[PDB]
Paper text:
Here, with the goal of combining the advantages of the P450 catalytic site geometry with the almost unlimited customizability of de novo protein design, we design a high-affinity heme-binding protein, [name], with an axial histidine ligand, a vacant coordination site for generating reactive intermediates, and a tunable distal pocket for substrate binding. We chose closed α helical solenoid repeat architectures as optimal structural solutions to the general porphyrin-based protein catalyst design challenge. These hyperstable proteins have large central cavities lined by side chains emanating from repeating structural units; the stability and structure of the fold are determined by hydrophobic packing interactions within the repeat units, and hence, the cavity lining residues are almost entirely reconfigurable. We sought to incorporate a heme-binding site within the central cavity of the toroid, with a proximal histidine ligand directly coordinating the iron atom of the cofactor, the distal site open for catalysis, and sufficient non-polar and hydrogen bonding side chain–cofactor interactions at the base and edges of the binding pocket to hold the heme in place without obstructing the free coordination site or interfering with potential substrate binding.
A 1.6 Å X-ray crystal structure of [name] reveals excellent agreement to the design model with key features programmed as intended. To aid with structure determination, the surface of the protein was desymmetrized by introducing two mutations K29W and K165Y. The heme cofactor is positioned as designed but adopts a flipped conformation, which alters the relative positioning of the heme vinyl and methyl substituents, but preserves the positioning of the heme propionates. Similar flipped heme orientations have previously been observed in natural and engineered heme proteins. The propionate groups interact with a network of polar residues (K15, S46, N50, R190). The heme iron is coordinated by His148 as designed, which in turn forms a hydrogen bond with the backbone carbonyl oxygen of Ile144. The open coordination site is occupied by an exogenous imidazole in the [name] crystal structure. Overall, the crystal structure shows that we were successful in achieving our design goals; the heme is held in place by numerous polar and hydrophobic side chain–cofactor interactions, and the heme iron is coordinated on one side by a designed histidine and, on the other, by a small molecule from a solution that occupies a central binding cavity. Arg43 in the distal pocket of [name] sits in a similar position, relative to the heme cofactor, to a conserved catalytic arginine found in natural peroxidases. The crystal structure of [name] demonstrates the attainment of our design goal: the creation of high-affinity heme-binding proteins with an open coordination site adjacent to a large reconfigurable substrate binding cavity.
Numbering used by the authors: 1 to 211
The structure:
């Protein structure tokens, strides 16, 4: 596994409340039974947690949405997640996502990520997008990267500026990417532990899984 995948396995284990070995085995099971990538399997597990449904129910609803709309599995899972976080129906979340996709000129997955991030941050999606675009221009990151920083703030419970501070510090101290730094910070929060412990666990899992 890559460092990204190792971190995400641990995040989704924490989100589902399973053991780490159980998360790994669920991800490989989804790969085999559905023919999806590891990343897609992890997105399925994450969306199951985001929506409070069983993995089976999340897959059923995602495949239905993906087919009805003709969108990516990734986009469908993000929309399901946004609907649950917003406390609304899938149809309502789709309407919001299509509006945003049109206004910004982004793809549906990005729009859904923005809706999810804003709901978790406790802000309107216009305010979240404004802050993300400020990060994009000032830091030279992508919109997707900026939204993950907002998501980090949302999970950690800090201002965006503070999440930026912490992620850039980790980036420089560890030589990781910005997305890796965000994800480690999220992991440490979801584990109730130090960043040092989170990093240690990600590296040990990666070694246990082959390096
Ligand atoms: C650049 C392309 C990427 C895209 C389009 C993308 C998309 C997404 C989307 C749609 C979500 C929300 C869905 C969910 O909660 O299940 C998400 C959440 C997240 N992503 Fe990404 N992502 C990308 C890269 C990465 C990378 C490289 C990492 C790690 C190194 C990462 C780590 C995370 C984490 C930790 C979450 C939050 C999970 C949680 O709730 O704790 N993402 N991403």
């Amino acid at each position: 596994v890559s460092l990204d995948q190792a971190i995400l396995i641990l995040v989704v284990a924490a989100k589902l409340g399973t053991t780490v070995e159980e998360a790994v085995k669920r991800a490989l099971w989804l790969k085999t039974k559905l023919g999806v990538s590891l990343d897609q399997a992890l997105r399925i597990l994450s969306a199951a947690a985001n929506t409070g449904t069983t993995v089976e129910e999340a897959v059923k609803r995602a495949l239905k949405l993906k087919t009805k709309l003709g969108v990516s599995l990734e986009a469908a899972l993000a929309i399901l997640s946004a609907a649950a976080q917003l406390g609304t129906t899938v149809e309502e979340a789709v309407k919001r996502a299509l509006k945003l996709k049109t206004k910004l000129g982004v793809d549906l997955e990005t729009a859904a990520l923005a809706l999810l991030t804003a709901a978790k941050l406790g802000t309107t999606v216009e305010e979240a997008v404004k802050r993300a675009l400020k990060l994009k221009t000032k830091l030279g990151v992508s919109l997707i990267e900026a939204l993950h920083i907002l998501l980090t703030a949302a999970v950690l419970g800090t201002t965006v500026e503070e999440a930026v501070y912490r992620a850039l510090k980790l980036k420089t101290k560890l030589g990781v990417s910005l997305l890796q730094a965000a994800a480690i910070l999220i992991l440490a929060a979801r584990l109730g532990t130090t960043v040092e412990e989170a990093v240690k666990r990600a590296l040990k899992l990666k070694t246990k899984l082959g390096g």
